[PDB]
Every structure is written in structure tokens, then in C-alpha cells.
Amino acid sequence: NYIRAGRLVRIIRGPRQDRVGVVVDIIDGNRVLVENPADKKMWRHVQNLKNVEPLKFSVELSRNCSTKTLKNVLAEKKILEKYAATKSARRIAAKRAFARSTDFERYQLRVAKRSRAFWTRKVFDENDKKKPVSWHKVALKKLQKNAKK
Amino acid sequence: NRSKKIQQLTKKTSTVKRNRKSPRLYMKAVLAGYTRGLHGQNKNTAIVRIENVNTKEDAAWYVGKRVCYVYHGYKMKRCVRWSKAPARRSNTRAIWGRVTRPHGGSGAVRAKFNGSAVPASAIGKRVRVYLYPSRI
Amino acid sequence: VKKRTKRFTRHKCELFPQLSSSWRKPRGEDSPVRRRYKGQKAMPNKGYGSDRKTKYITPSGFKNFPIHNVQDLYMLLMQNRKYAGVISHTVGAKSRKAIVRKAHELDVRLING
Amino acid sequence: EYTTLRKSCKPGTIAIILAGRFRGRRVVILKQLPRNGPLVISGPMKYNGVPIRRIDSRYIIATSTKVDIKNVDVSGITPDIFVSDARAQLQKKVDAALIEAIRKDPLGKEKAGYLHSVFTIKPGDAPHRMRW
Amino acid sequence: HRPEIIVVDLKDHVLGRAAAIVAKQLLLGKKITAVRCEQLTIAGTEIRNKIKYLQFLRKRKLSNPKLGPFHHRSPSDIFLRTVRSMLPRYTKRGQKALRQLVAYEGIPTNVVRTGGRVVIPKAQRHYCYRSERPYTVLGNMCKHVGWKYSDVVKKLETARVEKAARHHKKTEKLRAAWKSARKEALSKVSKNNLEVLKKFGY
RNA sequence: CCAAAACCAGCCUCUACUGAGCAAGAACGAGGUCAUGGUUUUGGCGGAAAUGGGGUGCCCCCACCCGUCUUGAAACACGGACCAAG
RNA sequence: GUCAAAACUUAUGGGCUCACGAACAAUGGAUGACGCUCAAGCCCAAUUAGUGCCCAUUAUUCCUUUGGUAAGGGCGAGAAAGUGU
RNA sequence: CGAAUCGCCACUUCUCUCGGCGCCAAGUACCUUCAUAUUCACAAGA
Ligand SMILES: [Mg+2]
Ligand SMILES: [Mg+2]
Ligand SMILES: [Mg+2]
After folding, report:
1. How far is the centre of ligand 3, averaged over its atoms, from the C-alpha of D121 (Å)?
2. Which SS3 state, helix, strand or coil, does residue C69 take?
3. Which residue of D has its CA nearest to A105?
4. Is there a contact between A133 and E174 if contact means CB atoms under 8 Å apart?
5. Cα gap E144→C39, rounded to integer Å
6. Chain E nearest C-alpha distance from B75 (Å)
7. Considering all CA atoms of chain E, what is the largest pairwise distance in Å, rounded to the nearest integer?
8. CB hemisphere CA count around D33 (13 angstroms)
9. Within 13 A of C70's CA, how many CA atoms are on the CB side?
10. Does C contact E via 3+ CB–CB distances below 8 Å?
11. How many angstroms separate the CA atoms of B24 and B127, rounded?
């Protein structure tokens, strides 16, 4: 999706990793002035285009637009609050919670990733009745040979 | 005897493998080689490429961590609890070191193994860099 | 803890059976060893001198002192923690019986008792 | 008394054993010994099977998680102490106190289960990137 | 028993970057198994690279070509030579590492259905070539240089693909089960866990 | 004897001005370390153990045959099969 | 980039380039080799990024030696008026 | 014959342009064995 003023890029690899921010104004073809009132550290700055990943979001806006205009307009859409809603955003905050996590939270996760992986099988075993599975489907048909004997 | 194969199909309800035995609390490194220039190697300072360390600021995390080149001889020899722990008498042997400092901007670190060099056979081979002494 | 534990062998003693391993300083402009190219044998120098208070000290911790007869043992009576008598190779097994049961009575050490 | 034992390691904290017979075992740090001495972590053995026993601070990873076990009396842990009835009796008297101290906490059910946990450096796993 | 092999899938990788990264891992003890070396790319038109190879093939000992440089024409043998040129091929450390590499044209039935296939993102063609610049797929140039099995491999590659694809919808009912079974696992008794799964994105 | 941890010391690393910048100064905190010094502690090993030496092989690495006259020798320059006595 | 220690092929730097490109006619074959081409090339700048790293017989520091016709102090076993052991 | 190695799988193991699980109760309920193996020491276990 096209990069232009008002596009809502996601910074990738820099000091401001995950953070997003609207493309205030194009400079030339390899740079832009990113901005975003919602984060403390997304004061207007020159991101390289290599560094940003355009998002599907993009407020309508005019080049070299003043910042207070932006703390306005994005507020009237909540392009940001709308953005965090997406799995693409949650995945970024999700990995940003696991890396940020303490050891007991990782217990507190493994207990769930087993609590669920256990019930994934419990659901499946119940549903094992309906084929197929190597253990059940192979066997039901497998008996077909046994019945013939 | 396929009689037994039919019986086996009913009983299996569908499990999974689970790792429930002895944990490893060491990272798996590699003895990438001795520290060296174009002119040759310093056999008294090994380089150790720890898995998933990729970065220099991770490599810094590992400084001081004790490191092991475990291998084996062809006969048993005295080990740390040869008498207290007979169970432990392998012809398995181990050479210990310390991660000394990060090497390069990647995840590699420098390990001096005691006063001695680690043997050149160790190269390309599993060093095991332990999480201790702990800091964190 | 010694600087160098290896002998400083003569260059190319290994090829020529006649050459003793004992050191001779290399000469000849083109000697790889005196021109001290890095892959070559080393030459002895003042820098390999042993640490000077551990010098002459045998792993027993004693400085060896030659001994020939039972009277020599008293040369070591008062400094028996510093010197250890090494009985000369040519004293008889006869006399060594006498040096030895006396080097025992005096608490003086003997390297070859 | 004197203690340079680090701020991350405090009594009642959960703490991974990095070395020795009990690798990967989460273990509450019951107390530090009277001089700048090794910690006396305890399992409790009721959970992960770790006996009361000494461990050097260098050989554990003090997790941020803990328990307000000031209430527990670990006073019977003294250096002179360091399976006989006098000791089997000691932990039984302690683990039951230590184990209830774990119960008092909200989210005290996980910490019982959290201490049944065993740490393991699984492949692809990056402790140095970990926080604890 | 199988050793800890990792079967790199070399399709659409730059020849010499993949050969350089692989040549390093072999030294670090990885036991790699390159496949689809037919699919390695090279910068430039095939004519650029045929002429590079035919200048290679042009080199032989006059005294006795029999013992001269050997001009293997298999893309895989070409990748092994490329990867032995990048490791200490005369010391045993490197002579060893080179034998820890097993190149194949295509992906052979022993190596298929063995595990997931790795990739080298630093050696990806899209990562390396400027996209609109011409590029030489390797097994394509070497077909013109003497490799005789370029069509034997394509017939084989066609078969593993049509076969792997048949098994991909043989198992569609199965994968669909775990997808359904796992989604309804969240609805199960994992309550507090359902919030510890929401955080972290599960 | 091998280890490991600690302590102390050492050692090392990790405001000001200006119109957001510098040509700019320390502090707190923490880490590392004995191939640094002094303080033990704690374990492991104990006919054998242990350190050292020696021998043989390997590994990685380094390494052009010496003497010679010569500006220049690995030289496609000379002398050089072995050893003993001289 | 590998060989080769180091950018596990760093840059959240700029340009340029398609075919060569990287200080001092005849045995087949040489950017050192491979290979590289949004370079692993060239010019430029950089150092984690509009918020570096590697390698010396070098330097510094530590230990030891040796020399000083160098500077001082001193006179459980030792304490010698001493160039040199 | 003592060994070094230390994730598995027919949910990856097709193609062409967050794979699942495992990590100490077969499960989220901690029922429940672990000590003296006496604070590192090849995991004494696979
Ligand atoms: Mg001339
Ligand atoms: Mg390298
Ligand atoms: Mg073992």
C-alpha cells in the first residue's frame, strides 16, 4: 500500500522499534518525516523508507502539516486505537510482552499453552471418534480386513 | 500377529512426547576456533559461537559464565566424584573455561579454558556454555 | 614455574645423528634461526632466565648439594630445610649405607637415598 | 553478620538452581547463612523434591517472583546444621510453614505449581534475552 | 537413528552467498544437506555464466588432463566445488567439513519427508539481486554445459511435487481437525489461562 | 592436589556552556577480574591420587635445506650420503 | 562473505555502475581463490543511526629475567661491607 | 563398549509468492515421590 503523507508507517528496526507514526511529509524518495502525538518518542523525525513498513491505515492529510493538526485529525478517527486492534499489531505487542516478561509469567503461560494443548487433544480424542487419525481412522478401516477374515 | 496390530489401534488415544528427564542448563556453543589473525592463532584464547547469541550485547551477558568442552578419552580416569559417585565414572572427560569477553559484534565470545589451551580437536565441536556463575 | 621447559636444541640436530642436541648459537647470514624467523627454533637468552628465588630449586623444594661421605652431612645439619644432599654417583653402596642411616638420624634430606 | 549477597537474591524469592543435583528446579530462597555464606534454598521438597540445603548465590537465578515468607521461621537453618531424624524433622517443620506462606499470597496457587516447574534451556531458547 | 542434519533448501539462492554461508556452518559443525542445487541462481544472463564456466572448463593440464582440474557439471557437484573453495580444503578440518555437506539436485526421496527444510535469507535471490537485473538459474546454465540429468531431475521434481501435493490434501481433513480442535480448546476449561493466552497473542 | 564461592585492596570496563546542540563535567549504580595483592572458606581426589617431566600420535596453527661468497640465496650459484677419530 | 580473526553478509547512509570492477600471443589459470552484482565493485560518509569489530615482537600495564661503570635503604631460616657465584 | 552428541512429530516434513507440541500431575486441580548426591564440578540421567 502506497506511502504518502498521512500514511501510518510502522517503524521497524531502529531505537523506536515497534512504534508507528504518520508520514507527515515526504522528503525525497528514500526518506520521510514520521510523526505521532500518541507516543512520547515519535516526535517528528527523519525515518528512512527502508526503515518503515507502511500500514494499511492512512489518515487523509496535507504535506508539512503541523503537529497539533495531527493530534487532532488522527483523534477524529482513532487510526491508532484502531490499529492496535489488528492481529498484525497484537502480534507485535505480543512478542513485545514475551520478551518483556518475567520468568513466572512464562510459567504462567506454559501452564496455559499446555492447558490448551491438553484440551486440543481432549477435544480431538473426543472427535477422534469421527475420522481421521492414524490411531482411529487407520484402525476402523484396518478392522475391515479383520472382519473379512 | 496382525491380531495384535488391531488391538493396538483401539488402546492408543493419542499422546505426545514430553521432555521430563534431566534438563540442560547449558547453552550449546561451538568452538569456532582459536583467536587468530592472518599470521596465525592464539591457541590460548578460544572463540565460542553460542547458539542464539547473534549480538554483542548478548555476548556480554555471557561473560564470566563457565564453559565446558566435554568429550571423552578411551579409558576411565579420575573424575570429580570418582569415589563418591561411581555412577559418574565415564571415559568421558571435560575441559572447563570461562567466557572471557565478547568477540566481534556478533554473538561470539572469548573463552579461555583455564591456564591451558583447549585442544584443536574441540574445534567445530559442542562446547557447552553454562548459565553460571549466575548474575541476572 | 619455569619460563621454558624445553631444551634449546641445536638447529637441525634432528636430521644429523652426529650432532648433539646441545645448543650452538647459529651463525651464517642466512640462518633461519639466528635471523629469528617466527616458525623457527628459539635461541637462549637472558630473558629465559628462571625466577631468581625459585632458581636452582628442585621440585622437592630443596637445592641439591653434592655429598660424598658421612661428614658432608653435617654441612647440611643446620640448613637441612634448604639443602638436600645428593650422594655422589660413585660412592660405594657400602658407604651409602653409612651416609643414609646417618642422613636419616640427622634430619637432612637426600635426593637419592 | 555481613552480606554482599545481591539485591536480586532475597529471602523468600523463587530461584532457579543452575547447577548441582537439582538443575532447573524453582526453589524458594529460605535464608542466607550467618556470614556472607551460601543461601539455604528449600524446595519445598513437598513440591519439587528439593531438600533444605545450601546453594551458592552464583549457582541460582533469582527470579523476580517471591513469597512474603518473613512469617516463616527459618531460624533452625544455621551453619552448624551442615537422612537423620533431626533434619528430616527440621524441614517438615519448615516446608509446612514455607508452603503455607506460599498459600497466603493471591496467585498463590500458581506459585505452588510454579515451583513444580523445572527450568530447561530448550533449543532456540535465549536466556540472555530473558528477564525473569 | 539420524544425526542432527539440517537440509537447506537452496532454491532461488545466490550461489556464492549460499555457498559462503553454508561453507561457514560446516566449519561450525553443522551437517547440512543442500537440495535443489539445480535451483541456485547466479547474477547475470546465462550467457555471462556459461562463458564463465566454459572458461573454467577450458582449464586442464596439458600434460595429462586425466589428473587435471575436474569440471563437474552437476549443479550439486558445482555447489560442492563452490563450497569447498570456501573452506580449508587441505587441512582435515575442512576436508571433514566438506564431507558433512550433501548436495542434491532436486530433493531426493530420502531427504524429503524427513523434516522441515531450512532457507538462507541472506542468500535469497530477492534479498540479493536487484529484481529487474537478469539472473542465471544454475541448473539451467549447466544443462548447456554438459549436465545430462537436467530433465531427469525435473521429472523427479514433478513427481515429488505432485506427490507431496496429493498428501497435502490427503491430510487436509486432519489439519482441519486440529485447527477446529484447537480453536475450541480455548473455549474449554482454560479460563484464567485464556487471559494469559490473550496477553502474548495466543 | 583439583576445584568453586566469597572479603578486602588494586584495576578495569559500563554539571557547564551554548542555540535542541557542544569543543562539555562529574556523580550514582552495577559488572568484570588473581596471568594482581592479601584474606581464609567449602567441596572433590587421596595401594594409589596428584603435579611435573619424558615418550608416541593426533588435532589446529606456524614453518623455504643448511654452510657460503654476495647488494641480493629457497634459489635454476657453490659445498652438502652416514657415522666415528682427527 | 568463505577461505580468515572480525559488519553470524552492520548502517534504521548517499550516489554510480551490467561488463567489467576491487598504493608502492603463444603449457591451463588467476581481484590471492572462490565467488560477489539492491556487491562481497566504485566514490563518499558512517558506527548501531535524524535518539562498531578484528589482527602486531607495537603502546600501556603486570609478572620474570638480564644489563646499568643506574637510584636508594639495610647488614622456621638468613642477615657476607659485597664488580662478578 | 566407558564413551562426545542433548528437542520431537505423518498439526512442519507441498508448491508458489508464531507449524504443533515439548519444558515435571496426560494437567491447571499441586493430589504428589524426591533429602545423606551432603553449595559448581560430563546430566550420576536420555
Ligand atoms: Mg653477484
Ligand atoms: Mg570469520
Ligand atoms: Mg554423562
Report:
1. 17
2. coil
3. D132
4. yes
5. 49
6. 25
7. 81
8. 18
9. 13
10. no
11. 13
